[PDB]
Amino acid sequence: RAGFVANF
Amino acid sequence: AIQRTPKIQVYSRHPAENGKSNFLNCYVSGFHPSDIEVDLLKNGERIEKVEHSDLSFSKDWSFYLLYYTEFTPTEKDEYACRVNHVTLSQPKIVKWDRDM
Amino acid sequence: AGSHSMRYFYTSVSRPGRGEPRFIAVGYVDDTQFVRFDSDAASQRMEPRAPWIEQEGPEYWDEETGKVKAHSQTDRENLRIALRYYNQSEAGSHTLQMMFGCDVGSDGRFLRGYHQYAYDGKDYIALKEDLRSWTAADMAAQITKRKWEAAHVAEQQRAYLEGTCVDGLRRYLENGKETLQRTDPPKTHMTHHPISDHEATLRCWALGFYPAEITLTWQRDGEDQTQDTELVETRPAGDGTFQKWAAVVVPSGEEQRYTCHVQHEGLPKPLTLRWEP
Ligand SMILES: [Zn+2]
């Protein structure tokens, strides 16, 4: 179950 | 941009015995960037129904791929893996050695 | 096994003049892949790659598909940001890789978490071990670090890694118990290959083992042969097991000075092998 990422 | 050359291993799933069906593997690892061409050869000719694993990478961010196909080895037939990558001047051909 | 990991690996590769970046995602429990997403594939869905993950209801597949597509979009944007940060042209192809995951012990307790990026194969930014701050590798990455500090990205990721990530891993381990918990020991043997009248190769083999973690070493007179050992990378057999061998070149007649040593979680005790003609 995956998490999330953010913009650079 | 970092570039790393592929490590190449060609090998059977099971110990070969002439006449018994098996799987021929070409494992390419440690390379970067990810674009790469991999063919399994039988007596110099490209084998057709060849599958491969989903692109993934190791702790050091280098990629690895497994290419495989069913096969039935014999005393006579030569097998090899041919690999091209941007780090290679020319395609690299690694012959299957049943003791490796 | 004594500890377990859940890991996701993301690769984006820009294709200038050929549309949006290629985006590939794969998820693993230990050394077993269980999902994939590939932007080139027609389904545009997260897809199963291990039997036990198909026990997940349809909500799962919809949700995981939504998340991986949102991830693809963000890393697409990320490739663009990086071009600007590094003042690179739109003509070149570039790679953005992302990995995250959690390790838990056999007691079900959190051991460590990861959340990190590499750009063109080099470390860009990574969540440190205490899950509270960032290792940013260069000038560009400090801009991202400042941005993520202000939005408290470290706390969001710590909560994910210690919470949902661990919950997910435990659930997968339950559903895939019959295969995921196995610790199949290597079957070992040794072979001898003459090179000349002066030398031969001794090769120690480990076959059929899971998980992939293994230590295979040669000793001469009880001493490490680190700088004289040919040691290949652990490789998949294709049937869910792994293979490895280590070899040494030995002077003729000196075979008995050499021992092969095998450590693997599946072994009741570490193995010592000798050449037995
Ligand atoms: Zn000593």
Numbering used by the authors:
A (entry chain C): 1 to 8
B (entry chain B): 0 to 99
C (entry chain A): 0 to 276
The authors write:
pmcMHC class I molecules bind peptide antigens and present them to cytotoxic T lymphocytes (CTLs). We herein demonstrate that human leukocyte antigen (HLA)-A∗24:02 and HLA-C∗14:02 proteins, which are known to bind conventional long peptides, also have the potential to bind N-myristoylated short lipopeptides. These HLA class I molecules shared a serine at position 9 (Ser9) with Mamu-B∗098, in contrast to most MHC class I molecules that harbor a larger amino acid residue, such as tyrosine, at this position. Thus, we concluded that the structural flexibility of the large B pocket of HLA-A∗2402 and HLA-C∗1402 primarily accounted for their previously unrecognized capacity to bind such chemically distinct ligands as conventional peptides and N-myristoylated lipopeptides.
In this respect, we directed our attention to a pair of mutually related allomorphs, HLA-A∗24:02 and HLA-A∗24:50, which possess Ser9 and Tyr9, respectively, while all the other amino acid residues are identical. Peptide-induced complex formation was also induced for HLA-A∗24:50 heavy chains (indicated with an arrow), confirming that the refolding capacity per se was comparable between HLA-A∗24:02 and HLA-A∗24:50. In sharp contrast, Myr-GANF lipopeptide–induced complex formation was reduced markedly for HLA-A∗24:50 (indicated with an arrowhead) as compared with HLA-A∗24:02. Indeed, a crystallographic analysis of HLA-A∗24:50 complexed with the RAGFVANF peptide indicated that the aromatic phenol side chain of Tyr9 protruded into the cavity of the B pocket, which may cause steric hindrance if the myristoyl group of lipopeptide ligands penetrates deeply into the B pocket. These lines of structural evidence support the initial hypothesis that Ser9, rather than the Tyr9 residue, is more favorable for lipopeptide binding.
